[PDB]
């Protein structure tokens, strides 16, 4: 099959960036680092992968992809339960992510591309909207009763997430923060539950 | 008075830097470059102006010791009133500065030293800790006679400038996203008040 054979050749294009990323790391490293390294595999294929900053785009696809069905997953063999059990069961596969050393390592080649001319995560973000793990939330807020959670779905999943993401993992990405245990994960979801459905005043 | 003398030459060298960082850009500015724009007021200045990044963090020193005394005049003429309106009247402060195009331009020169070998940022952070204005709240968390407020005092005043924020300025910085106006300023502070506060379920 010519099908299966391109999107193979596409995976290790992609393994070979993501290897040389981490090993070189990724301001060292050019495109012609690597055309050469993948061989005769790279063919000046056409989508993404005729730049190092599309390369990067194109595996933080997969990646994007794989959290949101890793999360979906979890929150889904729940869809019975109270809004504080669905907001637990998301807070937990949510933080578990921000908390790996890979998380990190994206987190840094995100911030690099701050003075990108070319705008490709300006381009990236726009247009994967829809992809991002707030989207689950916001179908949860919806089908709630409540016409506050109704109307400020969004506004409400893009405040859970970055009241439990923010500002670790921005102290991890910039000055090398140290990631949380899987105990000071599970003590800071039920930290941020609790002030997100009951609030501060008892 | 030489000491003057000293404080106004130094003035002159961050005057020098901050104009260079904004019409040339940082990371085309070099420590040269600000050397020999400054005249024959540099003198090889023995602080953080040895370098183009100590230099910036002398700014930056300067600019959050003025946000520190900015919110702290505004909530500190209201020690009388609510916890809900001590957390609107900083709310407004928080979000007043985070709103300007500067925060969005040393934003930027945050997140592209995020592969210094130097540790710049790593040791600005640390050892300016008790400069942030997050610890305003901290002292409004403890004089109150809630024991969850008194033992959580940081963890809550980190929480509520997140919330506020969060992730607002990382899509100015990151993609340049559009600031918010003064209306939509003090509609998202009495939204994460009212949720900070009083919670979700209601």
């Known amino acids: 099959t010519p099908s299966q054979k391109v999107l193979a050749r596409q995976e290790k294009i992609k ?4 290897e040389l990323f981490l090993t070189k790391g990724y301001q060292e490293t050019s495109l012609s680092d ?15 992968f005729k730049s190092k900053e599309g390369l990067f785009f194109e595996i933080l696809d997969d990646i ?30 949510f933080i578990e992510i921000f908390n790996q ?3 990190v390592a994206f987190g840094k080649i995100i911030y690099s ?15 994967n909207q829809q992809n991002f793990s ?18 400020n779905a ?8 970055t009241m439990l993401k923010e500002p670790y993992h921005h102290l991890n990405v910039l ?19 609790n002030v997100f459905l009951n609030g501060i005043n008892s």
């Open 154 to 161: 969004e506004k409400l999943a893009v405040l859970f997430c």
């Open 64 to 93: 994007c992809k794989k959290h949101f069905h890793l999360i979906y997953s979890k929150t889904q063999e729940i869809k019975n339960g109270t809004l504080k059990e669905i907001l637990t069961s998301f807070g937990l596969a």
């Open 113 to 127: 591309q701050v003075y990108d001319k070319d705008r490709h995560l300006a381009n990236w973000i726009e247009n």
């Open 134 to 151: 707030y989207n689950i939330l916001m179908g949860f807020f919806k089908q709630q009763n409540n016409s506050y959670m109704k109307k």
């Open 175 to 193: 000055i090398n923060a140290p990631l949380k245990n899987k105990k000071e994960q599970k003590e800071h979801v039920e930290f941020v539950v």
């Open 15 to 18: 393994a070979v960036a993501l």
């Open 34 to 48: 690597i055309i050469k390294l993948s061989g005769g595999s790279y063919s000046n294929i056409y989508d993404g």
């Open 101 to 103: 050393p890979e998380a």
